[PDB]
Amino acid sequence: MERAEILGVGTELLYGETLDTNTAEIARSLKPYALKVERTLRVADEVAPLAREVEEAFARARLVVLSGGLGPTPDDVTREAVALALGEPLELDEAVLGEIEAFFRARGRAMPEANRKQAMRIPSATWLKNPRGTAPGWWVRKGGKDLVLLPGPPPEWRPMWQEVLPRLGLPRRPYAERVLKTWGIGESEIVEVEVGTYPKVHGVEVVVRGREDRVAELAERIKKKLLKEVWGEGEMTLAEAVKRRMEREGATLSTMESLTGGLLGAEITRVPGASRFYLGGVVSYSVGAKARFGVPQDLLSRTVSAETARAMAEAARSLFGSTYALATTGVAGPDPLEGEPPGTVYVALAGPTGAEVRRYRFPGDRETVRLRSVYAALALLVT
Amino acid sequence: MERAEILGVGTELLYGETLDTNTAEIARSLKPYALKVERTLRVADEVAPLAREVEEAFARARLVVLSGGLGPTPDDVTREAVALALGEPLELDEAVLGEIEAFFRARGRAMPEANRKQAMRIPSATWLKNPRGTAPGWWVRKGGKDLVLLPGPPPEWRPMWQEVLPRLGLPRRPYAERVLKTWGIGESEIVERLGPLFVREEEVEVGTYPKVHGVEVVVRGREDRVAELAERIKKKLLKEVWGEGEMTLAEAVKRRMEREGATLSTMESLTGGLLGAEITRVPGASRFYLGGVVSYSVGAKARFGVPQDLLSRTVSAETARAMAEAARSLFGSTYALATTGVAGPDPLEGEPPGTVYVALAGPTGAEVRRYRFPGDRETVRLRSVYAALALLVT
Ligand code: NA
């Protein structure tokens, strides 16, 4: 089996100032292909060491993928390092220049001198169009091997890489993964090709991976064994599950939040099409705010309670006129509140036939508790 | 300046099934020493590729550090690979084999035969004690070079590494670094402004890192060069620098509210509550943040004060101003932030994705800033959050 070599470029990656997920993510995209990944690299922003690593990686590999260092500054030196590794001169493409120029003009700017170098390429390189940035990528086909240069930011490289990957003509292998996403059941209970369990803030994922035939058969048997706990598969998320229920019913949604601070509204609206059902929300972070939008005076001294969660959901529902409304209240941490520890949370749903509350006691730090709270609220609608 | 190579062993680190933070953490620990980290590797659990990588890393470096693959599984092959790469045989340390039996004996169990592996060392290796797990590591000194094998789990390796590092005899170099966080200025403009201040040399280097929260500028290297150079750069970037070091925008906004005795509220469209979420990330937000509304539908925009004539152009500077002034009046806060715009993937009101207006209303009036952010939907949302926060700290 031939090798794929994957290099992330950036000194800040070495030190984990920015965490290298790009190389990992590209390696994962390569599993359906019959290439071996023996190693991945993160390389500092220096021309000579980078050219050496690129030269060596290309020498031993069917495929080399580089990610990062395509910006306009003196620390972006990937194009120079690759040209040096392949013994080709860099040459300015006037058509690409016009396009960078147009990119800046739309934004009401003139094109800075330093961006000119992003329109440079070696003669062996075909351009990869960057739909979201000024630096197009490269695709070098040479001696039966492929070298691909990609931008560092994921919104640029993801669409680029999806487009070019099939075109590389790599040998395929029948690998697959199936992800079953559950809620409200611990790892231990679940236990009662390879099958793994993965605890996340949105619930425990059951992952089945390996030979596509065996993945297919096995995954069906497991989903059956976990039929009521499974809320979605693959790319499905709780927010998207909510959106599907809302559109099915022609229903609307609104929210009132305290400890989640607006994170619940943020997670609902993350999904395209949220405007078809989501009317809006209130972040009632102070006592004054809670009263002003409908929570009864009698409850304002006991905010960490089932009664308050219920009252907040009712108040949001009457304020927005939505079919359904979700509310969050409780203790995110680090401090206790009203004698209750961090991770003490009540989520509530108000709908046509009344309200329901669930209490949770969530482990984790402040941000973790906020996240688990957001997903517990969405789970009221889809579990 | 001599090289330090750092290898993380484990096939799952490649695919990010376990996030590799060990190599970066080892790399940071090397900062006070005059060694160059040109690269770090993650290597699969396979003896021949690993031996090759170790062999190459050791030939080019003053120091090689390996992390992981010291267990009892067939997939734990680091000891072998190193023995192979360095041209020395694996030798069984009887005592160590004892210590390992004691580990299992203190748990009610007899030692599995698999764990026998863990008592092999090469002649060049002296042991590094692991009182917190099964496998001890190695310190190998050879040809004036050092090679170290560390266990994978951090509670195990951190103490070990902390004890052996000051014994390696590495050249020392007084190190400093300075991180400047800017907003409202692109990388190309920073390059032009800094000119020859954008030094990249062996003694000291300047780097720029574009983030959703603005361009970060880092100066690192020799302590005596870093202070002065960083200061000159700060001077050139003065009005655009909002924080240093560990500082975050949300923390910066918290400092200004506490300093003034002032309160804050928000009104959000495209960000959907993400601005309030970011503000309340910081412990102690309730001392100043009164709350906010997410006016996602047209009906909710009108309910919370957006003028009816503006509802055909919610993506505009006039609307942003109106939103910020409405939240201010509605919550009685000293300040209010607003966001309005087009997240993507579709246009809205004829305006393309990335079109964003953020506004701030306060005691002396209101102001609005306009942006055309590239990125996907989640990116534009995030940029808008930080753009709104930057209004209060410029
Ligand atoms: Na880049």
Numbering used by the authors:
A (entry chain B): 1 to 192, 204 to 394
B (entry chain A): 1 to 394
Quote the original article.
Here we describe the determination of the crystal structure of CinA from T. thermophilus (TtCinA), which contains both the NMN deamidase and COG1058 domains and is therefore a bifunctional enzyme. We use these structures to propose models for both enzymatic activities and suggest that large scale movement of the COG1058 domains is linked to ADPR catalysis as well as providing a rationale for the usual asymmetric arrangement of the TtCinA dimer.
The complete structure forms a dimer, with an overall oval shape. It was readily apparent that each chain comprises three, not two, domains; the third domain sits between the NMN deamidase (NMD) and COG1058 domains. It forms a KH-type fold, with two α-helices packed against a three-stranded β-sheet (referred to hereafter as the “KH domain”). These two domains superpose between the two chains with a root mean square deviation of 1.1 Å.
